[PDB]
Design a protein around this ligand. Structure first.
Ligand SMILES: CC[C@H](CO)Nc1nc(N(C)Cc2ccccc2)c2ncn(C(C)C)c2n1
Length: 309
């Protein structure tokens, strides 16, 4: 039995934030407790959107409810896209007290702040969130899944190669997270302009306090569409696989990214099968075919090989 506390957004239609993390973790055998940080008709990639957001105090209300009935015991805490700095400071308090109620509680954090386009990245969230993620959040994170744009901001050091990209990660580990994964970066992969490159190193503390920093590289064949929520579906499954492979980041990212590709391919197909030739598919048709990728989520056919080091 493994109980995860997933504090992310919810949407009536589509798979983003919690909608993107729940079903996977559930079919992967996990016990998902979901706090919906917001509830909107759909993600903001759409033309329109309406909805309500959960504030800082309401997040707490729900936590006290859990605490009062003495059911605030968890094995994992998964947080993602957040706009409110007060809401995030609240997430840190919760995570710190949950780590006191004691389990080898693993805090999987996706430091969502924006994405990267070659020279400068467009920040999604307000810049008053960076300090908090850097100063209060990451320090208590165990597994963080940033962008390259995110890894950079977090360390205040920009990335221009695989080499200095591992230097940013080493810098990250120092802040607290023993596991880091750069889910996507500008870096040209040894496979061509056609492949996206993911990076990630695990600084394991083996018996007798030795150092162990296994680093890896993943190459996912890109896809002709702009998907929403892939970051969320990723961190969720990563959570799942790193549980199965606690010291084998290699196999965890493999299974993770492999299932990633299976769902994205199945998605881009139905989006196309649902859109005439010459017309670009809509955020609506690009929604992940989640329910359909069940088995693939359950048992990912390894079509990717993690390059050790
Ligand atoms: C930031 C950009 C995107 C749009 O492409 N919109 C969006 N919108 C989201 N929405 C669904 C939540 C939401 C709705 C209204 C205001 C704030 C947050 C959302 N939840 C997780 N994610 C990403 C990080 C996978 C979400 N992304």
């Amino acid at each position: 039995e493994c109980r995860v506390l997933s504090i992310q957004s919810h949407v009536v239609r589509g798979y983003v934030g919690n909608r993107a993390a729940t079903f996977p973790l559930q079919v992967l055998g996990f016990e998902v407790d979901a706090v919906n940080s917001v509830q909107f008709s759909n993600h903001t990639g759409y033309s329109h959107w309406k909805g309500q957001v959960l504030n800082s105090d309401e997040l707490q209300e729900l936590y006290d409810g859990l605490k009062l009935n003495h059911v605030n015991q968890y094995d994992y805490v998964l947080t993602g896209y957040t706009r409110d700095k007060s809401f995030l400071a609240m997430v840190v308090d919760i995570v710190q007290e949950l780590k006191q109620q004691n389990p080898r509680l693993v805090y999987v954090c996706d430091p969502v702040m924006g994405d990267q386009r070659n020279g400068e990245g467009a920040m999604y969230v307000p810049d008053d969130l960076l300090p908090v993620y850097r100063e209060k959040v990451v320090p208590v994170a165990d597994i963080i899944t940033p962008n390259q744009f995110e890894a950079e901001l977090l360390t205040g050091r920009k990335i221009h190669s695989q080499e200095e990209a591992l230097e940013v990660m080493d810098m990250l580990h120092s802040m607290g997270p023993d596991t880091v994964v750069i889910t996507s970066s500008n870096l040209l992969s040894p496979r061509g302009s056609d492949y996206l490159m993911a990076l990630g190193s695990q600084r394991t503390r083996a018996p007798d306090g030795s150092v162990v920093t296994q680093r890896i590289r993943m190459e996912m064949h890109k896809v002709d569409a702009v998907f929403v929520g892939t970051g969320d579906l990723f961190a969720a499954m990563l959570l799942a696989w790193t549980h199965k492979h606690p010291n084998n980041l290699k196999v965890a990212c493999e299974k993770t990214v492999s299932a990633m590709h299976h769902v994205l391919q199945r998605t881009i197909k139905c989006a196309k099968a649902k859109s005439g030739e010459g017309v670009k598919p809509s955020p609506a048709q690009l929604e992940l075919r989640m329910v359909q990728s069940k088995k693939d989520i359950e048992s990912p056919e390894i079509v990717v090989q993690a390059t050790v080091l």
